[PDB]
Amino acid sequence: RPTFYRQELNKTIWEVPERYQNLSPVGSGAYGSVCAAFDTKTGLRVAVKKLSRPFQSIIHAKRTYRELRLLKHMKHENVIGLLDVFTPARSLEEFNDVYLVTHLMGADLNNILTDDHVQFLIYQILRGLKYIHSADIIHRDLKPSNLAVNEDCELKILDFGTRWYRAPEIMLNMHYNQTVDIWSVGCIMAELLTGRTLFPGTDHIDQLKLILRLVGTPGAELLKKISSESARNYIQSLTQMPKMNFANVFIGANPLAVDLLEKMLVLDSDKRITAAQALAHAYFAQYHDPDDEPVADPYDQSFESRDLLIDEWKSLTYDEVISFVPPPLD
Numbered sequence: 001r002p003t004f005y006r007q008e009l010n011k012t013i014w015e016v017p018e019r020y021q022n023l024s025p026v027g028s029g030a031y032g033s034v035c036a037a038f039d040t041k042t043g044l045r046v047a048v049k050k051l052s053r054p055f056q057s058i059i060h061a062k063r064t065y066r067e068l069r070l071l072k073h074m075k076h077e078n079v080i081g082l083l084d085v086f087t088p089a090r091s092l093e094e095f096n097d098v099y100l101v102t103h104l105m106g107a108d109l110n111n112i113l114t115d116d117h118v119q120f121l122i123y124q125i126l127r128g129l130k131y132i133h134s135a136d137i138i139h140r141d142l143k144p145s146n147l148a149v150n151e152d153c154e155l156k157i158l159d160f161g162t163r164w165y166r167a168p169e170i171m172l173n174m175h176y177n178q179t180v181d182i183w184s185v186g187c188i189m190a191e192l193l194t195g196r197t198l199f200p201g202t203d204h205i206d207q208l209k210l211i212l213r214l215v216g217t218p219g220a221e222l223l224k225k226i227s228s229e230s231a232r233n234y235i236q237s238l239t240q241m242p243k244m245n246f247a248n249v250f251i252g253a254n255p256l257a258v259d260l261l262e263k264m265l266v267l268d269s270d271k272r273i274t275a276a277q278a279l280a281h282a283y284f285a286q287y288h289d290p291d292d293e294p295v296a297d298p299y300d301q302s303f304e305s306r307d308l309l310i311d312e313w314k315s316l317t318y319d320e321v322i323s324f325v326p327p328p329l330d
């Protein structure tokens, strides 16, 4: 049990342990706020996030539990990791605030390309996605602002609080699998290669039109898989557009990058390349190492189907804080 100290940070109040110093607001929001800090114990610069109204309601309580559970499970170089989780509370009764700690990251993919850089960045995203997907976890909202990158060009996936990077199947809500994330990677890789948003739709309808112009309208095989009567009708009522040749769209780009893009941006999710399969694509020949692209321990998401009371979620959250085991010093 450490010693905490208070201080007001941009309307937001903070009560962190002594080891953390020089809290400097990196931002704030409805979610709460994130402060840059110096970890006196390790000497490393960290990011400390205070959740706002963690247990204001059952949904909030559950979201709080969900985030903590996810963060505690992630142990991979290309995925945000939990350096520490703490609360000023001395017991469950007083338990009302949650602070999460991780290594400070300098910028995001938005803030920030040569082909070698695209290769290295996409390689790392895919390496992180292989790990996440092996634990039956789907990001569902991959985008540049969710990808942290430091000065070494090292990347970490995070989230897991916009439609420009969303797979078409999950933007209308048929069935979807882990590859919705692969689609997002495709949109991201395209943007890094061209410097422009691949599908900057004004809304979901416009978004879909933009996508179909590139990948072509659904073929007969894909149509046979659309259970939604209305969606099936709409799609079939549209202009029958031919699939463009990506080489003709991404002119001048590495032919291998073009090939990968064509394998990632496929409408039929059943045929979309997976993260593991993508890692072995020739485009990453310079970085791919089958012996160093680990999968994750099994992840128990059964809690997602549970309907509990606010007090019960708060309590489950409290236990997760208490049981937290710090990572080996780096």
Ligand SMILES: C[S@](=O)c1ccc(-c2nc(-c3ccc(F)cc3)c(-c3ccncc3)[nH]2)cc1
Pocket (backbone or CB within 6 Å): 026, 027, 029, 031, 034, 047, 048, 049, 071, 080, 081, 082, 083, 100, 101, 102, 103, 104, 105, 106, 148, 161
């Ligand atoms: C919903 S809003 O757009 C929003 C923006 C940022 C964050 C946000 N949460 C974190 C953050 C901090 C510690 C953790 F353990 C986990 C996440 C960061 C962070 C991580 C590394 N370096 C600097 C800042 N940014 C949360 C919500």
